A paper describes a structure:
In metazoans, the α/β heterodimeric hypoxia-inducible factor (HIF) complex activates the expression of hundreds of target genes in response to hypoxia, including those involved in cell growth, apoptosis, energy metabolism and angiogenesis. The activities of both the PHDs and FIH are suppressed by limiting oxygen, resulting in HIFα stabilization and activation of the HIF system. Most of these compounds likely bind to the active site iron and compete with 2-oxoglutarate (2OG). Many bind in the pocket occupied by the 2OG (CH2)2COOH side chain, and as a consequence contain a carboxylic acid, which is often undesirable from a pharmacological perspective.
Recently, a set of tricyclic PHD inhibitor with linked pyridine-carboxylate, dihydropyrazole and triazole rings, such as 1 and IOX4 has been reported with one compound being in clinical development. This series has the potential for more than one mode of iron chelation and 2OG competition; we were particularly interested in the possibility that the triazole (an established carboxylate mimic), rather than the pyridine-carboxylate (an established 2OG mimic) might occupy the 2OG (CH2)2COOH binding pocket. To test this proposal, we prepared and studied both the acid and tertiary butyl ester (IOX4) of the ‘tricyclic series’, both reported as PHD inhibitors, but of uncharacterized selectivity and mechanism of action. Using an antibody-based (AlphaScreen) in vitro hydroxylation assay for PHD2 catalysis, both 1 and IOX4 were found to potently inhibit PHD2 with IC50 values of 4.8 nM and 1.6 nM, respectively. To obtain insights into the mode of PHD inhibition by the dihydropyrazoles, we made attempts to crystallize the PHD2 catalytic domain (residues 181–426) in complex with 1 or IOX4; a crystal structure of PHD2.Mn(II).1 was obtained. In the PHD2.Mn(II).1 complex, the inhibitor coordinates to Mn(II) in a bidentate manner via the nitrogen atoms of its pyridine and pyrazolone rings. In contrast to previously observed binding mode for other PHD inhibitors occupying the 2OG binding site such as IOX3, 2 and NOG, the pyridine-based chain of 1 extends towards the entrance of the active site and is positioned to make electrostatic interactions with Arg-322 (which is known to be involved in substrate binding). The 2OG C-5 carboxylate binding site of PHD2 which is reported to bind a ligand carboxylate in other PHD2.inhibitor complex structures,is occupied by the triazole ring of 1. Based on modelling studies, IOX4, for which we have not obtained a crystal structure, is predicted to bind in an analogous manner to 1, with its tert-butyl group protruding towards the entrance of the active site.
Residue numbers in the entry:
A (entry chain B), F (entry chain B): 188 to 237, 253 to 404
B (entry chain A), E (entry chain A): 184 to 232, 254 to 419
C (entry chain C), D (entry chain C): 188 to 232, 252 to 405
Write the structure that this text describes.
């Protein structure tokens, strides 16, 4: 299951078909647990902006190589879909939103990542909660594809990667959880949208 | 053999009042393990011989399915005109459906919103030993104008009745294992007619010719 | 404009980009008046009245004309209209609405896939000021961040998808209203519909 | 923790920032058990059962105790609790829920301003695994982009606004459930309520 | 004088069946111009002597308002137990309300969702010569489980009846001129009782003392 | 009715009360019609980005002095509310979104200007449609204040200025219109929100 294959053979169609792509075992046990620890590190040192504990990583951070690995690893796959994903000309990506979600019975109401057209067109999420039994611990992502007669409960299973369109096509809510959960989110811009979105400023 | 079905008593003394009061009626241990597992096989067979398929009941390798349908009919028969104001004159084929276990769920919806004639939805679950607590697949019903709602388990050998119009909206929680169910809709004499008139059944129509004579 | 041009250069793209298409001055005040007269006369032989017309019936010639000219447009869009293979049609729903002060709740024509894929409406209300008598059709094209109010303008023709893509509500009217409606079936879908019924 | 500290240092701010406040280990497994026994015994003299308790009745002493200790918390929050002037209370709604597989539809306690401003619930279900038996209370704090699932944990006390600010639904239970509920009235509001009724 | 009111015929032959069938009933030219304009003055007077006020009917300068109420009662009286299954044993005071003309509207809502005893909302419009086409203020009702909805004009000397439970949700379009209306709710014997029991009326209560004896 | 008065005496309270402030006759007939023409100018020359004809003005544009007047005129009022409007520390503002709305029966579904927290906290709109009879031509703004039992239909009357919070508190839809209408929209940032919103990028 090589790199460009996953991209042009599974992602692109599965995405242009439904608008949701799941990828199990993206980096492997050892490589994943690595990030798994590397993220728990940041949970202590500080600089964690924003309960709702999140923080933004650029990849070249002090000692956060593996997070950078993951990021730069996703970049490949998205690059390998150039012009294939809808009419979207994808170029840049936000910094990695490494987030530690509370898990105290807290859930997040349904919403849309990019309803205004702020540029973000492909949400990309990585789950790193080792042995996160969603059957008991809960904390599942639920997506309601606009105009479809079905919906999907995606579990934050360990070492799972998830893609979906960020616009009004994918409204989604997150069932609450009872244990602490970690996850890394990333968005990708459409060259035109991200640009048009910038004429507002000075 | 099959479990004895006192269709008359079960209709008049239980199903009818239940339906009238609540609009939802469950009947467990409908055909017994013996017939149930059998239908299990019969349906898992058609898998070979989200996908569905329609059955009249006479098809080969579908004997017990036709049996199930005949039982459903047996129950609706002894209801008479007591089951709501509806006069049930007929029904659809049996929708034998294979639902996948990929964590897929079904949005809130209503079987018959347009008024196409269907008045009573009827479902039968044949999943041998299905723990809804483990695999999910629960069916959530919201009885219109009530302060409660109900999570019905797709328990093995369970039969489910409910009105199909705006009165019973429902969701289907995702399942994490393949699941099987047979659905049937009963028609109200009048509504089905006006439906056929209004072209809400897709049965009628008018041919559109390839061309017309100029002028 | 010829039917082919109107079809291929206007209707097909308008229907693909939006799923809603208006066509003003379809048959001209000349023929439109006759269609109107036929209908008004037809509905003299206070809720909403509807009588289905084949087109061949007496005193319903011009109605049939309208239907024919509709079918031609549909012929020119054959294959190019969405992803549908249209082979069927419904009788002309000649409908006389009350105009008392009651609108029709927001809904969708074909929610369960009964075969119908294109709703096609023709208005006959001469000098109908929507800002005075109302009866406006509000459509909410699913997905699009805008919505539209279509006025029952005389001699107006209106196409739109029948599925969940175009839910819509009718604003109340304060005067007698007339509108002929037809639906078109997708060859496959309508056939897939019949399957559930007994032989 | 003393009632005053718990009141002024925890409940008042928690109620102001959110309008929802949980308090675990309110009376301890010691007294909680007795409250439970009183209730369970009380409900032996399959839909949901409810019997209102004043607290003074026989075999309902400990219930009354719970009520008292609730009132004290309310006394310590006097004036500081939202913008309400609490002067009244309802009898203890001792409720036994079925646990058959039926939840209670999403709703709001006080939608028309009947006087009630604070819903206050105390759970008595020993060793109640919400992940096995369910019966969870899901609240949607209006305005906030999050929502919460409150587990009917034994000896748990739960405060929340009764108005449109906190709509909420109860997940179905798969075992017999017990929960005592009380509401508090805002002096003005409840008085403004009576006005509409005849002398 | 006032217009003759055949309360008996109007109740039995029109209002009752109308209500039962649709759940909404309008009665125009209820009291005639004479009494109508009078109530006009009577209410515009209380403005002096979004604001509201409650009236029993006996208040000075409210004679014709009490009259209006007595008429409403007259009509509901001759309904008997025919008006739904409800047994109307009483009602609220008359809510005389002054609605402002600042382009303010009222969200979709339901008078009695909790089940507080109110079963029938009753409204009377006294706006001398109000063109709803010009100033708006229309009341839109959505009869639960129906394919139509209705825009009721707050026409002068108009009386309006409808169920107050989940069956009749409604919106009020904004008005661009001051508007006046008198509302009244009738109680169902049973529901009001269970309501008083459930403390849904705010009437009952329990005193909370300033302090308690320590220990 | 001087400048700082309108600000601290009417805006701030009316805003902290409801979250919607209307101001009739902001610049006056002659001064308003001026913008009224100055905007119709741009409708021809070009450079109108984005039917839905809109364009972004910085105020110092060629010959667009009066638009700049309006912008710089609003700036005063918002400056005169420093720290008074909620807990919002307002600093910057987007470029003026001068928009020519179609008016062919087109309406805009209800929405929220800033549901994600992109910085914008105060929507400010100026209407310049001379004698725009909304009774006939229509095209009215309808706002549904979150948690309130009433809603408001604000007419785009000529020379009217409108303020409202942009976040989830003010969902709003626009009734369709039948004639061409022009309007100038502006947003204001909360120093903290606009800042936090920027950690995403690189
Ligand atoms: O900044 C934004 O627009 C923004 C950020 C995050 C976000 N999402 N989406 C799904 C999240 N999630 C939470 C737990 N599991 N998943 C989550 O946090 N959506 C939008
Ligand atoms: O064609 C129709 O009208 C139609 C089809 C399906 C359908 N439903 N609803 C809930 C179903 N389900 C799935 C699993 N367990 N239950 C199911 O099959 N209802 C109506
Ligand atoms: O059978 C159905 O579901 C069904 C039938 C008709 C219908 N339509 N369509 C357009 C209508 N209209 C336009 C102006 N006044 N009325 C109208 O009533 N929508 C749905
Ligand atoms: O009268 C009313 O509207 C009314 C009454 C009770 C009520 N609540 N509140 C908390 C309940 N609950 C908690 C766990 N199981 N049930 C519950 O049923 N909500 C509203
Ligand atoms: O207290 C209550 O339950 C209560 C109050 C008001 C109310 N409504 N509803 C529509 C009203 N209206 C306003 C103008 N024309 N009609 C009006 O007054 N309904 C119920
Ligand atoms: O870019 C954005 O997020 C954005 C831009 C504009 C916008 N709004 N709001 C009200 C508009 N309008 C239209 C007619 N009358 N008013 C309008 O255009 N909302 C959000
Ligand atoms: Mn998200
Ligand atoms: Mn269904
Ligand atoms: Mn329609
Ligand atoms: Mn409740
Ligand atoms: Mn009301
Ligand atoms: Mn906006």
């Amino acid at each position: 299951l090589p790199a460009l294959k996953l991209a042009l053979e599974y992602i692109v169609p599965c995405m242009n078909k439904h608008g949701i792509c799941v990828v199990d075992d993206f980096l492997g046990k050892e490589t994943g647990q690595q990030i798994g620890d590397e993220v728990r590190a940041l949970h202590d040192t500080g600089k964690f902006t924003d309960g709702d504990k999140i923080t933004w990583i650029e990849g070249k951070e002090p000692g956060c190589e593996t997070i950078g690995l993951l990021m730069s690893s996703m970049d490949d796959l998205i690059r390998h879909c150039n012009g294939k994903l809808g009419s979207y000309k994808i170029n840049g990506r936000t910094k990695a939103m490494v987030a530690c979600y509370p898990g105290n019975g807290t859930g997040y109401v349904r919403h849309v990542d990019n309803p205004n057209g702020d540029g973000r067109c492909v949400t990309c999420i990585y789950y790193l909660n080792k042995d996160w039994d969603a059957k008991v611990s809960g904390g599942i992502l639920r997506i309601f594809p606009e105009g479809k007669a079905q919906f999907a409960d995606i579990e934050p299973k360990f070492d799972r990667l998830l893609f979906f369109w960020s616009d009004r096509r994918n409204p989604h809510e997150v069932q609450p959880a009872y244990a602490t959960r970690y996850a890394i989110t990333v968005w990708y811009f459409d060259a035109d949208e991200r640009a048009r979105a910038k004429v507002k400023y000075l």
